[PDB]
Amino acid sequence: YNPEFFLYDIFLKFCLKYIDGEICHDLFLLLGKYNILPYDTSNDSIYACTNIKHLDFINPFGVAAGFDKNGVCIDSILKLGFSFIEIGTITPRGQTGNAKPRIFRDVESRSIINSCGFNNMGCDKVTENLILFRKRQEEDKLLSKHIVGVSIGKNKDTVNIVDDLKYCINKIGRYADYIAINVSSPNTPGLRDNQEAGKLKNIILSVKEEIDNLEKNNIMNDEFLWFNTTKKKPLVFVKLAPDLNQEQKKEIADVLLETNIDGMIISNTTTQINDIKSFENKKGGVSGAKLKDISTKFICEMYNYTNKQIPIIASGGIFSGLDALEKIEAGASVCQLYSCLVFNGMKSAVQIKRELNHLLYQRGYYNLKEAIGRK
Ligand SMILES: Cc1cc2nc3c(=O)[nH]c(=O)nc-3n(C[C@H](O)[C@H](O)[C@H](O)COP(=O)(O)O)c2cc1C
Ligand SMILES: CCn1cc(C2CC2)c2c(CN3CCC4(CCC4)CC3)n(C)nc2c1=O
Ligand SMILES: O=c1cc(C(O)O)[nH]c(=O)[nH]1
Secondary structure (H helix, E strand, O other): OOHHHHHHHHHHHHHHHHOOHHHHHHHHHHHHHOOOOOOOOOOOOOOOOEEEOOEEEOOOEEEOOOOOOOOOOHHHHHHOOOOEEEEEEEOOEEEOOOOOOOEEEEOOOOEEEEOOOOOEEEHHHHHHHHHHHHHHHHHOHHHOOOEEEEEEOOOOOOOOHHHHHHHHHHHHHHHOOEEEEEOOOOOOOOOOOOOOHHHHHHHHHHHHHHHHHHHHOOOOOHHHHOOOOOOOOOEEEEEEOOOOOHHHHHHHHHHHHHHOOOEEEEOOOEOOOOOOHHHOOOOOEEEEHHHHHHHHHHHHHHHHHOOOOOOEEEEOOOOOHHHHHHHHHHOOOEEEEOHHHHHHHHHHHHHHHHHHHHHHHHOOOOOOHHHOOOO
16 A cells, blocks of 8 residues: 555565564664654544544554553654554663573564563663653644554662662653553563463552552643643553463452553464474564463453453454454454564564454454444
């Protein structure tokens, strides 16, 4: 539909075959930094407009965390045709992450394994970048109504987790539309994180208190306090890992209901996949198609464990419009992509939005919001 997407798709096969994955990522980010990526300025289907409570997404596809970990590429990625982006995961202080090489691709299974280790330049710098973005958003029509969430985590060496989360809120909170709590990374030596119910409940409540406190202590109206899209206080989501037993899943669902979390992103990568030939000697968590079915099941479980009272953000192995519908019919309200962009390139959003629209009419739905859990 656009002559510009195609050139990047041509060079994609070469890069995927010959260039280190992280080098591919750095080059992609540099291209987007200089505003020479393609665009998708078509109007979206009003019947595919989705929402998470009062958060209104123009379409149901965003970019998952870990893509623009530092918010240096926000405009260009969004203008590819996504309704929202999740930057991060960020930590208060910068971190270089694990030793390179740390990202390896298996083209045949369209899978990736990564052991990045929360490499980022730190909250202060990323906050400055998001401020620059919000100022550009005021003057750029192609960014109006677009949503930016911030994924937050902990530095590798931090003793307590709530402290790091509170600092990020107190610096970047008034510029974020939503906050994603990452307690699911496989690349922190503390195996994943304190997803135990007691710790998680206290963590969530502390975050909500810090958000509420930014509001209280100010003289300006809410319009000028929240320099975001909504002009409203940020929502709270949680990012979950797939390597959990049923008791843990049930316990966290009970905690989410008690603490009134605004959403749950299910899920992050898994370290339990052992049938990828090229990754057998590679450390890290695996992303892509091989996580699809696993994550879909997790959606069904939590959607049921939470009595359909907690909205679901789907992440894992989404490549096609059918994949998205599987997530939606399982209980998800919105979808995030990552591996798809690695293997399909610039055309990811346009293709998947068109695919889902066609499938959505075929199955007879008036709109996709009616389809959540409809199977
Ligand atoms: C290189 C790499 C870095 C990632 N970094 C983060 C991160 O910083 N924070 C996070 O919550 N998830 C991170 N993820 C997980 C993705 O956001 C996503 O949940 C997962 O890769 C599944 O997406 P996919 O199957 O479409 O590839 C990362 C994944 C990869 C491959
Ligand atoms: C997981 C790290 N990561 C990241 C990427 C890119 C983020 C999108 C990878 C890519 C695709 N890039 C897209 C753009 C070009 C540069 C000109 C065309 C190709 C590289 N490929 C093939 N592998 C990637 C990877 O491993
Ligand atoms: O949640 C996460 C974090 C990372 C990382 O940045 O190392 N990698 C993943 O695969 N998942």
